[model samples]
Target chain A: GGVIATQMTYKVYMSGTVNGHYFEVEGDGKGRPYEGEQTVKLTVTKGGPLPFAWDILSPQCSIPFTKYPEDIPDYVKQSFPEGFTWERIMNFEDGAVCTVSNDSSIQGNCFTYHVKFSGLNFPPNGPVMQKKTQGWEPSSERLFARGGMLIGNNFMALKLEGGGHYLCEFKTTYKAKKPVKMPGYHYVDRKLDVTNHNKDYTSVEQCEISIARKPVVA
Target chain B: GGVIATQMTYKVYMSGTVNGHYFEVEGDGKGRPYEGEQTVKLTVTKGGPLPFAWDILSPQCSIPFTKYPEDIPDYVKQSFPEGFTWERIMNFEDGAVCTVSNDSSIQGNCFTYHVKFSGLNFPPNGPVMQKKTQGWEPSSERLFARGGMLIGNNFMALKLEGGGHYLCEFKTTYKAKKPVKMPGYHYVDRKLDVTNHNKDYTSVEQCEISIARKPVVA
Candidate 1:
């Protein structure tokens, strides 16, 4: 009587501008992180002279980079060098859970349904400000759309035969910021338990034998 | 915060003799009973005789049927009339369990697993019985393994992407019949609790802005 498994992880980053050159995009989502749209794939680089050319778009398009700072480019110094800032993350793939067990009783037993984790990430809303503007403008699609703004439905399962006990639940409420302080919204809950094992008929006894035999005349 | 789910049911009966005539078999299993092996499909009746060439076999075959009555057939009377008998069972088809749950998030959640029936009817000995024969006979099957004498795993699960708390377990034991109330061995245990609901990052934040441009005084 002991079973408790839990896994959780989330990440997202942003810095705009795609046509004026000056890009910064960060998103590495695999399973369970803002539930829904997660397809991040963008790589754009451009530094001082030398005919610098960087363009990465599609998946929504419209991004050149530049959050603020008087429009940047006094002579184009280093957009990302010294340690290379931007991780270029962009993870998206989660949705799959499975299981199947059957110990040989007298013989004949083979049930298989194992393929856990194919995709999962749920964080409808809790933060503020999202304008990476599509995949970052470059075409060929980089698949950008991390948290879609919350509220959609992704994956779930519970179907049995000859056993008992099963339950699943997931909930959330986002928005939490700290620095100058002034961002509040917090709540997270998850409960799951699927137990199965009950196939014994107490030695099995449903007895009744009678065949009256009354005809043996040749 | 609530989860408690458990369902169980079992039934069985027997009587056989094909070619020479005389037949009777009953079984209705769903969640519990026999533990496994359930494929009943056989029907043969003949009283006045008219060609009567009933031959139900295969699936491992070799089930002429006869719990005892000296092997049956003194003249074979009621093929099934007055008050009617013989329900002509023959059920077999077990091995399928499934689950998938994802409800946006918000209150009301209960999934439970509570059923403890262990060490049941394990007639590895005693009980004038022999050949239900390690998974029935016939080239294909006879489907009478029922619970396989009890004592053999059934099913389990634990795969996560987001959300948390998940576990699975199952155990068995069989053979228990009583007249003077002797013959012992009974046990059945199932522990399941697959609860889910959790997604909140509390106001997400990951800031970094730089495409620097400072250094050029020609």
Candidate 2:
């Protein structure tokens, strides 16, 4: 078969086994501070930061068996789909308000500002396929790379009575398999409607906001 | 309906429209120096280099129309597949000896050494799918990021008589949307069997080789 691309997104506090680490990453790739971000520590020393780092070089799937085994565990056999291997096409560090107690806190607020982190990877089973007779051939060994960025938050918010504002800065630079470099950032603001809010505080609202930048001499 | 990934690979002189600019890129993401690399200029001033840069923020697809209209162009409307946008996931610089005048010349020899640059992309149509009810929702506005590197090369060279050697150094550093930085390089050496070379040498040979790196002090 040919290369196959897959994309997925999860909510804050969603945990999963990524690259061997049982990691529970929070926030959207856009840098939104979810209740999970506040509850989740964004500390490098203590563990789990807003923007954390994960190794991308490691093969995503368990080491394939050298030879077809007589007693292959279903888990091992099913670890990866056909034509797929855990090939880490990219790696990144997600940055958010690593601190919550300060002005970056999203607690007790009707709604919060957020940034997201998202991208792509090429599993051993990628989109392009080799000719049937090209097995293990160098020509058939297609190179694969993938990458992404949270340019800025496309803000969407609710106008609530006595609404308050929350702000934070986001800066990130991305390097793909090639030498190209991509740097982007945004000042994120979350407007909270403090008055006449939901009694259960379960209502969430967002608005489409523009992204502006502070002039910097690069 | 969901995120869709596409995969493809190009030759050293292969060209594509990336991030707006009409770009012609070379080298296999796998880090192989083809004869084409020598023919292709690695100059940045006059344009075209072994490794180059392109804007990453541009949607990989044409701007989608907000309102359905009767005058939609077949090309524009069908530009992006699924409900997805085009996203570039990675970039890189490949290393190989572009010159072959010395003992490294694969020309006039029996074999040629070739490696490849390859990878995948998560088009707006990717592995991840958005809920039909999640239209334009912040939760549905999934952020995307990806990346890759020249971890190594898959060598393919014909075994020629009087095979000579060619060498070139490749250095590359990749940054993802996040701050995590990954830098790597390789000293590429292509060996050919050029012993009893021919007058009209037209034969070719190749062998796959491993990528070794020089240790760096962090």
Candidate 3:
């Protein structure tokens, strides 16, 4: 038997503004959008205006950018004068459900004791957001691109070092048309979306198959 | 039913002088060593003296540091005052064999046509080393922490920007003892060495087995 490699692709556009810091994350036309069944790790544009863009939103923390809007964000479109580029995107709905945990003898929701969005920046790189009630798993699966009210005074998380809080609001609305494949025509474009994003990273072995005994063909 | 994670530990010591540019890379006392059936990707110290250490040796390109010398490199050991820290270290031996490839017909060994060690450094960062017979699949498998001779006048590769050559020679000699686990005693230290390096990243499901038809179940 031969190994079959199925590569998928989709469009993603994520833009946001933290304080007055504006940035956009566009995936490469061929990025895998998830990690296992719990994380929505979309590959975004590397080396952009806001190197801190990733700092504000870690792939593991943010939801996938799978929805489409009537029109692209004005700033995103303007950033790419000619036209917006497309990247690989999958689905972004219902993956993992929050689990119960608590070795303290008291049952409770699973919580990440401590976490900080580490980045390639100075002190206060990513805001410290893992306090007592900082990062608690959701009761159920997460919603698509919907985290919280865009009103923490637009405050996202607090700075890791300095006393100041990291205030911001993020947005993501995806839209991309399928491109023409060069090698072979009539091939399927599997986006590896939400419904079946949890893939088995294992090799499936198949033995013999059915082929009628009689065959006068070449 | 139950999940058991085996985290390995290996002390890595990597240091090199690229054109008199001194730098060292030491992995955190806990680092996973290999990738798949045919690649070696060790996680080294993130931010280090040599931001370009990784550029000089991509995990996939270099071999694993499994062999232990009589003494740790003086520079590396001295670099770390109280003594060198340990990350994860497994074995490095046989893995996948080279295969044949060639779309242009003549039928030749598999080769990575063009690849450059991209880094955060300025131009001429990583010399382009994929010219003609630059990269070719190994006949058997990669050796332990050994690539080519530390010669070329130490010429590693050619610069990507200017017409200059990047001269360098690297060294790696690992030596890390088993640490005392805080959780419990005698938990069996499995280094995930060269032999069991090609791990199946899949769920090794189990149906009902046996507890010898338990007399008194807890």
Among these predictions, the greatest TM-score belongs to 3
C-alpha TM-scores of all predictions: 0.13, 0.19, 0.21
Off by over 4 Å in 3: A1-55, A58-158, A161-218, B1-59, B73-163, B166-218
Q: What Cα-based lDDT does every candidate model obtain?
A: 0.17, 0.20, 0.20
lDDT of 2 by residue, A126-154 (tens): 21111011111000111112343222212
Question: Judged by TM-score relative to the true structure, which candidate is superior, 2 or 3?
Answer: 3
Off by over 4 Å in 2: A1-186, A190-218, B1-13, B16-20, B25-150, B153-218
Quote the positional error of residue A173 for candidate 3 in Å.
22
lDDT ranking from best candidate downward:
3, 2, 1
lDDT of 1 by residue, A1-218 (tens): 01100212222233343223333333222221112111222222222221111111111110111111232221101211110111112122122111111110111111111111111131122010111111110001001111211110101112213331111111111111111121111111111111111121111111111111110110
Candidate 1, what DockQ? Answer: 0.01
Decoy 1 TM-score against native: 0.13
lDDT of 3 by residue, B1-218 (tens): 01101222333334322221233333223222122112223333323334232323332221122221223222121222122221111111111011111011011221111111111111122232222112111111111211111100111232333344343222122221222211111111111212111122111111111011111223
Chain A agreement with the truth for model 3, given as TM-score? 0.23
